Amino acid sequence: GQQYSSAPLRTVKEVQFGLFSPEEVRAISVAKIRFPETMDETQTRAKIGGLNDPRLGSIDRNLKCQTCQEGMNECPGHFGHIDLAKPVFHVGFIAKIKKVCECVCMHCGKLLLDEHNELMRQALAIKDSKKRFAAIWTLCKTKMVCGGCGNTQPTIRKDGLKLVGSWVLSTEEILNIFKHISVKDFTSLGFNEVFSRPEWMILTCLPVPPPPVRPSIEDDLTFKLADILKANISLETLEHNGAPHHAIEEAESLLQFHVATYMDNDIAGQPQALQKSGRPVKSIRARLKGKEGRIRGNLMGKRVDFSARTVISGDPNLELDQVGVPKSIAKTLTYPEVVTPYNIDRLTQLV
Amino acid sequence: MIVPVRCFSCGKVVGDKWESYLNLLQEDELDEGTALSRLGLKRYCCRRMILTHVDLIEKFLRYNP
């Protein structure tokens, strides 16, 4: 099998889903990602201190891997992290985020209706998170004017990968808004305390998947992370140096684009972000979507050992509960039988 | 390819009766049935074996290698 661990063997009883807070993201990471260069650095078969660090996981059939060793067969994946020059949107939350901004006015950070209203009392009475959020979102998006801070809440609509306002919303702005919704307002619309917050839906810094996720025989995910890092550094270069008005914004939307398409590539937006080979590239979303996905294709059903397949034929001289098995298959397929005093002779003869 | 040496069904030798058969078709100007009958092919399995056969080796010999 593998090896002996001092830890007790336990069984997974509960699965608590949640969001990844940037704090916990950078706290979990074991390597910062500064260089977009993959492995080779100036004609050298090694790993530069940027992408694919030996800290994330060595890849040369060695015996060492981030001090913990254990080769590359025992060691799983050690996550990294990369800090974005500016916060961007998580694609799979684009809708949800856009809903939250409609349940809470701008600048302030408070629910439009409280226990003073008649219908809001009935909407906040539901214990089910999804049903509650769905009941409040429909009875709060009609509110234009507003605790105080009476501001005319703008009409927000979706456009590409940004958000507009009618009386263009910045991602940093929405970050600042979701940062001020506090705790009591989270329970009122599904979210959790320390597990999932709206201030974590937007991507401040994103975790970097280890080599056992994106191998090399380079993987598409490595290329896409290289694109994200490239856009990031190209953004930072245009920010620290000469910073025009209508030039760095395109870079912000570029980083937003690459990050958004890094996870989901089949969006309403026509740019599907092709690759060098003309391939539409494989996103993480496509890795899971059946039927060739990971869930339906590698978890619900997967290829197994100790199996066989052959053309069938009828046999009048076989019993009902019998099966005619070819000799070659019989020699191929095998069964592990422990040596006991009852069968030691027979097993010895078989060996 | 070439005329099968023996009939599949029964086992009668029919490989030595090919050329003769051809003669009985072109030299004596007979029909296939009588030609097959004269060669001692009474059973229709051997009769088939010769009548049904196509000599493809002649087209094969048309190449120089």
Partner: protein, 127 residues
């Protein structure tokens, strides 16, 4: 294959022996009969290779055996192959004693006609 199907003389086959029974390595003269075949395209026309071209090499030591049966009128026998102009076929054949139960090439008989009670008086058949 068709070489295997060539009818050979099996008169004194009873004083020949199985190769699996003989105490010799592979085969010998007491168990097997070796006969060669050397053909080559000579004329511009197609050069036929019959069973008469088979030449016994091994020592028959008296036993009537190995000789390929030729019931052919012209005396050619089974048409084995055909050669073009410069095509050559050189090989050797080791013939052994065998049962038709093992392979149909060792079949001594062809079709055996068999019929009992032509009037169905036993009523073994419902017409």
């Amino acid at each position: 294959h068709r070489l295997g199907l060539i009818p050979l003389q099996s008169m004194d086959i009873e004083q020949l022996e199985y190769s699996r029974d003989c105490f010799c390595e592979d085969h010998c003269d007491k168990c097997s009969v070796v006969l060669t075949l050397q053909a080559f395209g000579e004329s511009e026309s197609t050069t036929n290779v019959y069973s008469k071209d088979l030449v016994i090499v091994s020592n028959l030591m008296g036993r009537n055996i190995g000789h390929p049966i030729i019931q052919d009128k012209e005396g050619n026998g089974v048409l084995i192959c055909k050669l073009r102009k410069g095509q050559e076929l050189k090989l050797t054949c080791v013939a052994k004693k065998g049962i038709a139960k093992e392979h149909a090439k060792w079949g001594p008989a062809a079709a055996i006609e068999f019929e009992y009670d032509p009037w169905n008086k036993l009523k073994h058949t419902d017409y």
